[PDB]
Scaffold this motif. Structure first.
Motif, short mmCIF file in Angstrom:
data_model
loop_
_atom_site.label_atom_id
_atom_site.label_comp_id
_atom_site.label_asym_id
_atom_site.label_seq_id
_atom_site.Cartn_x
_atom_site.Cartn_y
_atom_site.Cartn_z
N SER A 78 2.62 -12.13 -3.47
CA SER A 78 2.24 -11.02 -4.33
C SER A 78 2.65 -9.75 -3.60
CB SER A 78 0.73 -11.04 -4.61
OG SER A 78 0.19 -9.75 -4.78
N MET A 79 2.88 -8.70 -4.38
CA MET A 79 3.32 -7.43 -3.84
C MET A 79 2.25 -6.40 -4.15
SD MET A 79 6.85 -5.57 -4.90
CE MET A 79 6.61 -5.67 -6.68
N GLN A 80 1.81 -5.67 -3.13
CA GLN A 80 0.86 -4.58 -3.29
C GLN A 80 1.55 -3.32 -2.79
OE1 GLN A 80 -2.87 -4.85 -1.14
NE2 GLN A 80 -3.73 -3.03 -2.14
N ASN A 81 1.90 -2.43 -3.72
CA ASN A 81 2.73 -1.28 -3.39
C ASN A 81 3.96 -1.76 -2.62
OD1 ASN A 81 0.81 0.61 -4.61
ND2 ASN A 81 -0.54 -0.08 -2.96
N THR A 170 4.02 2.52 6.10
CA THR A 170 2.95 2.49 5.12
C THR A 170 1.62 2.23 5.80
OG1 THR A 170 3.12 0.13 4.72
CG2 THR A 170 4.59 1.57 3.49
N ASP A 171 0.54 2.42 5.05
CA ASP A 171 -0.69 1.76 5.48
C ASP A 171 -0.60 0.27 5.13
OD1 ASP A 171 -1.34 1.55 2.73
OD2 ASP A 171 -2.61 3.32 2.75
N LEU A 172 -1.68 -0.46 5.36
CA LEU A 172 -1.67 -1.90 5.14
C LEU A 172 -1.98 -2.27 3.70
CD1 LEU A 172 -0.99 -4.25 7.14
CD2 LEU A 172 -1.35 -2.01 8.17
N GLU A 173 -2.22 -1.29 2.84
CA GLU A 173 -2.17 -1.51 1.40
C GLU A 173 -0.79 -1.18 0.83
OE1 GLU A 173 -5.50 0.68 -0.12
OE2 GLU A 173 -6.93 -0.95 0.25
N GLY A 174 0.20 -0.95 1.69
CA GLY A 174 1.56 -0.71 1.24
C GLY A 174 1.88 0.70 0.75
N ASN A 175 0.99 1.67 0.92
CA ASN A 175 1.25 3.04 0.49
C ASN A 175 1.91 3.83 1.61
OD1 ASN A 175 0.23 3.04 -2.22
ND2 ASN A 175 -1.85 2.96 -1.36
N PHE A 176 3.09 4.38 1.34
CA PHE A 176 3.83 5.12 2.36
C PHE A 176 3.05 6.35 2.82
CE2 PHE A 176 7.81 2.77 1.86
CZ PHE A 176 8.46 2.98 3.07
N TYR A 177 3.19 6.65 4.10
CA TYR A 177 2.81 7.95 4.62
C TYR A 177 3.94 8.93 4.33
CZ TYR A 177 -1.05 5.71 7.17
OH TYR A 177 -2.22 5.04 7.50
N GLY A 178 3.60 10.07 3.73
CA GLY A 178 4.59 11.07 3.40
C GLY A 178 5.40 10.72 2.16
N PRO A 179 6.47 11.48 1.92
CA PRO A 179 7.22 11.34 0.67
C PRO A 179 8.30 10.27 0.72
CG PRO A 179 8.08 13.21 1.90
CD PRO A 179 6.98 12.59 2.76
N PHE A 180 8.17 9.31 1.62
CA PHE A 180 9.27 8.39 1.86
C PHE A 180 9.14 7.14 0.98
CE2 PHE A 180 8.37 10.69 5.92
CZ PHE A 180 9.43 11.57 5.81
N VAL A 181 10.26 6.45 0.82
CA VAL A 181 10.37 5.28 -0.04
C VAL A 181 11.14 4.22 0.72
CG1 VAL A 181 10.23 6.53 -2.23
CG2 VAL A 181 12.45 6.19 -1.10
N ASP A 182 10.94 2.95 0.33
CA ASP A 182 11.67 1.84 0.95
C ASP A 182 12.95 1.57 0.15
OD1 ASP A 182 10.09 0.95 -1.17
OD2 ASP A 182 9.53 -0.92 -0.17
N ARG A 183 13.86 2.52 0.30
CA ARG A 183 15.12 2.58 -0.41
C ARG A 183 16.02 3.42 0.49
NH1 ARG A 183 16.35 6.59 -5.40
NH2 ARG A 183 18.56 6.03 -5.68
N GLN A 184 17.27 3.01 0.66
CA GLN A 184 18.19 3.79 1.49
C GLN A 184 18.66 5.00 0.67
N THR A 185 17.89 6.09 0.71
CA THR A 185 18.27 7.35 0.08
C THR A 185 18.57 8.39 1.14
OG1 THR A 185 16.17 8.55 0.00
CG2 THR A 185 16.53 6.86 -1.68
N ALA A 186 19.03 9.55 0.68
CA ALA A 186 19.06 10.74 1.51
C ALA A 186 17.64 11.31 1.50
CB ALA A 186 20.08 11.75 1.01
N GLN A 187 16.79 10.71 2.31
CA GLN A 187 15.48 11.25 2.60
C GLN A 187 15.47 11.60 4.08
OE1 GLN A 187 12.52 8.14 1.74
NE2 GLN A 187 13.83 6.60 2.70
N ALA A 188 14.84 12.70 4.43
CA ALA A 188 14.82 13.15 5.81
C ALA A 188 13.47 13.76 6.10
CB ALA A 188 15.94 14.15 6.10
N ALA A 189 13.01 13.57 7.33
CA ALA A 189 11.76 14.19 7.76
C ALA A 189 11.90 15.70 7.71
CB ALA A 189 11.39 13.73 9.16
#
Lengths: 289, 283
Positions: A78-81, A170-189
Motif C-alpha cells: 500500500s502507498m501512503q503519500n 519525508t516524514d514516516l507518513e510519506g509527507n515531504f518536508y518543504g515544497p519537494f516532490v519525488d520526481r526529477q524536476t527542476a526543484q532547488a533548495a
C-alpha cells in the motif's frame, strides 16, 4: 561535540528493498517495511512518474525484501503519500519502542546512513529552514530519528538529492518536508538561513561552560535584533523563541535580548581568532539543557 | 562533508556498570570478562589496593541483571573482572592501539547506559577533544569491532586522556590525581590534505594552483604554523587520492601553504578540518 544517538535500536530495523533493478533501504517495524515509493520507478519513470499506475501493476512478489541473510515474504502493499508500506509475514523481533513524529525546521535528529540495507554511519543533523538536510547520502530510505527513554521517534526518511548537494525527504507518513516532490524536476533548495534560536541556545551553553568573552553591556529590542540579524541571513526570532530560551536565560542570569545584543555584536565583529570558529546552529535549546 | 561515526549497536550491547564502593563508572563486557579503568578501586598503590579487594567488592550490572564477579586481575591500567555469565551479544572484536591523527568513534556512556556516539581523532599530543569513565572508542571493519580507546580522565584544559584496551596510556599521563597538562597541540597535516582531496572530489577547486612545493620547504612552512611535519609515508598514504584527482601531494601541499598564509569557502568550512584521515575520505 555534536553527538548522535546510539544507533543500535535503528540498525536492527534496516532492510534492503529491491523492485526490478532498483534497490534501496527500508525500515522494518513490526510486520511492515517502510521505504520510498520511488523504488518502483525506473529512472526514466522519475521524470513524470504516475505512482498509482506504476503500483497497480505490481504484485507482492515483485518486492524482494532482505533482512541481512533472510528474505522476507511480502504479503501486501500500500502507498501512503510518498512512502510504500510492504506488509511482510514476519514481525521484526528487534522492533524497538517507537513512534512517528513530524519535526519542524531547526529541530535536530540523528541519521543512520545505510547502503543496500546495511548501516554505514551515523551522524547528527538539523532540519534546515529551507527544509533540506546537509547530509552525506544509494542511501535512499535511510531514516532520521531521536531516542527518548528507549523510545525511538522516527522523523525523516531520505528520498531525493537536490542539485546543490543537499537532501530532501519525508516524514514516516510519506509527507515531504518543504515544497519537494519525488520526481526529477527542476526543484532547488531556497536560500538557507541560520537557525537563530539555536545559535542563542548555544551561546547560553557557552556561558554555562564558563565562557563569556562575547558578552557586552548592550541590549536590544526584539525588532531591532531581527532587522540586523536578517541582514546576515539569520532566521527571524519570535516571541515563541524568546520564551523557549527562558530557562537558559534564568540559569545563566543573562536576559534573552541581552544575549541577542551579544549575537548582533558577534555578527558585526566575528571571533577575532577565538572560539568552534563558527556560530553553531544545530544544537537546540532542548539539546543544550 | 559530514563527520560520520560508526553504527554503535555492536558496542551498545557490551556496556555495563561497574561499582566499587562509592565509585561507579562504565565497563566493557566481552565474553565472560568486564574491562574498566583500574582507578575504579580508588598517590595510589594499585598492586596493594587490589590485593585488599575481593570479588565481593565489585558490583557489575548489565541493565537490570547483576553479574557475579568470580575473578579479578589487572592488566596495566585496565581492571579485568571475570564474571559468571558470557555476554551473548559479544561481537567479533580485536584490541588495537592507534596512532596520533587516527580517528575512531566513541560511545559516550553514563553509568553503563549509552548516551551518544561521536567521531574523534587522537590528537598529536595524545588527548581527545570530546561519569563517562570507561566509555570506549572503536572502529568497525566489516563485522569486526576494533576497540582502540578507553576513557580514564579529564585534563584541566577540558580534553580527555585514556588507554588502549590493554591498559597502556595514550600520552604522558598517569591514573593519579596529580598535576598533569596536555602538551601543545598540533594540526594533523596529512588529515588536512585528505580533507582538501575530499573538497576537490566534491567539486571545490578554487584553492588549487599551478605550483608545486618540496617536502622540505613545506615542512619549514608547516613547522611555523603549528602543523605536524609531513613524511614520505604521509605522501604514500595520500597516493590513492592523488591518482583519483590528478593532484599530486606536493601540488596539494602548495595549495595548503598558500591557504595557511593568505587565508580563504572549502566544503562550507572556514578553518581547515583535520579529523578526517585519508582512509575516512576514501570511505
Amino acid at each position: 561535540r555534536k553527538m548522535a544517538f546510539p544507533s543500535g535500536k535503528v540498525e536492527g530495523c534496516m532492510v534492503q528493498v529491491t523492485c526490478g533493478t532498483t534497490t534501496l533501504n527500508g525500515l522494518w517495524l513490526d510486520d511492515v517495511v517502510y521505504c520510498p515509493r520511488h523504488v518502483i520507478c525506473t529512472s526514466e519513470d522519475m521524470l513524470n512518474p504516475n505512482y498509482e499506475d506504476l503500483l497497480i501493476r505490481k504484485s507482492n512478489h515483485n518486492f524482494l525484501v532482505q533482512a541481512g541473510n533472510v528474505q522476507l515474504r511480502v504479503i501486501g502493499h500500500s502507498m501512503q503519500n510518498c512512502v510504500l508500506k510492504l506488509k511482510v509475514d514476519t514481525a521484526n523481533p528487534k522492533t524497538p519502542k517507537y513512534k512517528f513524529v513530524r519535526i519542524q525546521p531547526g529541530q535536530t535528529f540523528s541519521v543512520l546512513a545505510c547502503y543496500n540495507g546495511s548501516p554505514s554511519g551515523v551522524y547528527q543533523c538539523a532540519m534546515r529552514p529551507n527544509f533540506t538536510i546537509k547530509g552525506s547520502f544509494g542511501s535512499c530510505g535511510s531514516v532520521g530519528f531521536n531516542i527518548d527513554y528507549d523510545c525511538v521517534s522516527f522523523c525523516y526518511m531520505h528520498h531525493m538529492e537536490l542539485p546543490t548537494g543537499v537532501h530532501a525527504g519525508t516524514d514516516l507518513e510519506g509527507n515531504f518536508y518543504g515544497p519537494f516532490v519525488d520526481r526529477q524536476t527542476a526543484q532547488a533548495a531556497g536560500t538557507d538561513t541560520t537557525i537563530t534560536v539555536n545559535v542563542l541556545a548555544w551561546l547560553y551553553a557557552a556561558v554555562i561552560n564558563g565562557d563569556r568573552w562575547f558578552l557586552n553591556r548592550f541590549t536590544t529590542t526584539l525588532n531591532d535584533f531581527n532587522l540586523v540579524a536578517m541582514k546576515y541571513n539569520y532566521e527571524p526570532l519570535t516571541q515563541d523563541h524568546v520564551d523557549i530560551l527562558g530557562p537558559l536565560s534564568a540559569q545563566t542570569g543573562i536576559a534573552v535580548l541581552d544575549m541577542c545584543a551579544s549575537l548582533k555584536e558577534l555578527l558585526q565583529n566575528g571571533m577575532n581568532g577565538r572560539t568552534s570558529a563558527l556560530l553553531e546552529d544545530e544544537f537546540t535549546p532542548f539539546d543544550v539543557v
